[PDB]
Assembly symmetry: C3
Homo-oligomer: 299 residues x 3
């Protein structure tokens, strides 16, 4: 194609650990790069941008969808993957990975493992999940999905639904959206015990007030949440937060249902055939955003 693939220069050589490290301009640059990669790959073009570069996982907890998304992205850039399964100190493991790798993709059940990893690593680390902390590449792919499906991120009303306390995806997404866009409204839908934590909401208070972002907490998918949301973004944790075909009769015509996956019965299979079910297409947007990120980091 006549499209080019300029890497996002601000990401060069950088570790990706938080949604906080991206500007609005970084995000759009990554969206447009991901979209151009999508067009080339879908036309059958073979990219050889990262020939001879190695990605290695550091997955102290398992996620085949995550791991495989990253490997596929690296491979479609012409890069290669070396496996390193854990089942020795984290520091020694990291130094070992650094001896042969160009980029590390780390997932860890401890939230602070990223900081320790960063202090010894010589190559960029991409955070693929640090306990209940963040999942910054998921936030970026989630935002690509919103943009590609609805045409706009500014002005949206989004429901964040499920285990908001322990959901690292909703943490990164709220941060990324509120910091960089003019979000109209965020419904935070969860049982009181699993509400969105204060250590996510407080740093955002200034931006929320300045931009006039409306935050409403509920413990249920009310008819209001269903009638006003452009995006229903749901996660694993009962009948009052479930999205099924019956509940979808209240939804706008123009909206999407998203879910980072895996799901349980908070997202019924009765929704899967609805055009508005975006949660499978989300994963494909995932591959392309990850391609954009990797190329930008390693260019």
């Amino acid at each position: 194609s006549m499209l080019e693939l300029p890497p996002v220069a601000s990401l060069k050589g950088k570790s990706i650990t938080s949604a906080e490290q991206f500007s609005r301009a970084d995000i759009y640059a990554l969206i447009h790069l991901a979209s151009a990669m999508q067009r080339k790959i879908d036309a059958g073009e073979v990219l050889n941008l990262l020939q001879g570069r190695i990605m290695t996982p550091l997955f102290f907890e398992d996620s085949s969808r995550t791991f495989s998304s990253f490997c596929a992205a690296m491979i479609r850039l012409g890069g290669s993957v070396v496996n390193f399964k854990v089942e020795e100190t984290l520091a020694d493991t990291i130094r070992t990975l650094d001896s042969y790798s160009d980029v590390l993709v780390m997932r860890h059940p401890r939230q602070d493992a990223i900081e320790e990893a960063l202090s010894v690593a010589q190559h960029p680390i991409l955070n693929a999940g640090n306990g209940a902390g963040e999942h910054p590449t998921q936030a970026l792919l989630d935002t690509l999905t919103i943009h590609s499906e609805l045409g706009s991120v500014d002005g949206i009303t989004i429901a964040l639904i499920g285990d908001l306390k322990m959901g690292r995806t909703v943490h990164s997404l709220l941060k990324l959206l509120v910091r960089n866009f003019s979000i109209k409204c965020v419904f935070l839908v969860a049982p009181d015990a699993l509400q969105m934590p204060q250590d996510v909401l407080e740093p955002l208070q200034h931006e929320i007030a300045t931009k006039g972002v409306i935050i409403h907490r509920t413990h249920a998918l009310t008819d209001e949440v269903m009638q006003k949301s452009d995006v229903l973004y749901t996660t694993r944790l009962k009948a009052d937060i479930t999205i099924d075909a019956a509940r979808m009769r209240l939804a706008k015509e123009k909206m999407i249902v998203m879910h980072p996956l895996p799901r349980n019965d908070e997202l019924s299979t009765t929704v899967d055939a609805d055009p508005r079910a975006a949660y499978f297409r989300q994963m494909r947007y995932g591959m392309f955003m990850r391609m954009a990120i990797l190329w930008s980091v390693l260019a």
Copy 2:
């Protein structure tokens, strides 16, 4: 090119020996052989650069997935691993988001049809319970062709656990439907005999082509003297609930109710021009004493397997 893809396989899932015609089988054979000549001469092929194969192995066999991996790599393709360690449909959709071809192995026989109804890219059935193993039948037939020269006219013994042997299920279908086989010996204890749901759909073609079918429970002198191909198999213990008395009887019958071991002594009765085959892996049914015999084709079979898998992958994805 030297390597024209088999046009009828373009974009299609490979699930049963029944989907292939005689012409398809010969086109794949000649493509596999052409690939073998190029690979053995040291040529690098770049036909599937940028394409991804991924597993969907719900019973595992790093053994079988690795043979498909090697084929993909020798076509210039790439591999992404997926560990099943969530619904079957959601898993498929996940692999579909990033892959070009899925290679699926599953303990349930009906999981393939479920997969097919949600999958967007081709699925290669690498084994569905005691159902089928279609690519094994293709590579087996390539082996017969390359080693003996002709498939029509052969006398073939299918030996061992024919009840649970997905290999012999696929192979019997592929041979009877597409070739004129002289005689099939079904050599097994009664408890592990070839199932009715394989034999009955083939009854019309068996009759119409005048294929001789004989059941035995032993490698008798007649079987040893007449067979061009002795195709033997492992007892599928994984398919048997050891604790139940039915399954313990089926288990025991392999040694207790049949005389079916191939060793060097038994091979003194074989023809000069024949081959011994086994899909592998094996246990004691096929003695290591046979391995030195020039008629022992079961290692060469795996090499033919690589090239047949390359022929199939290139044809599916071209």
Copy 3:
């Protein structure tokens, strides 16, 4: 290119099972090839030397470090890896024949010492021994020697301590053989209790080399001041899996200014993290030298 990256011709098509199979010339040829590989990879050059060739690991015991090192090395030569995992009653020989039907090279690690010889009797393609019980680890010995050469500038004339479980340690078995057979080693310290000492079946065959080059060998139970003061290389290993063998910042005050501490890894408390910031701590650099030595080996085997 035969100018920049000439393969070591002696290794063409050959399985690598023991440190004993290499000459001094082979080792320097591998060292110079490994350094040239390093220069190109570090400058960002992409190698296409082994495009279309397949390395298959066959690891009957785990080692993410040894496994990933070989995989990285194959990939950086442009080669490919088939990710076979061990874990129906299939034998070792049949597993080997299976991998052999589609591979160009096998990399085998196994808890039984004799498994390598059984594999070699059936394999048609070269097998690289990545560790055979308490026998040998020949590619570790090679990368260890590259590490010494590169860090200190010379292998001839060094004083080296081999520390830890010398009885069961496959890395120290291969290293001692490779060094004494092919270099004029000044002095070897074998630092271990008698129960875990260097085996007699490693020392006895080196008798001729020890006499002919006048190599000094002393046993100690502990890491004495003398060992610390005279050693150019301190090569340590896990004592189990730790009485008076620990290297820490305090012990290092006794070391020469110019020397290196090495460890094939993983480590327990025999090598304190307090040493990690020292310029003499070469045990992380050692792993990177490993990749490049494995590149020189793979290229030489398969060219």
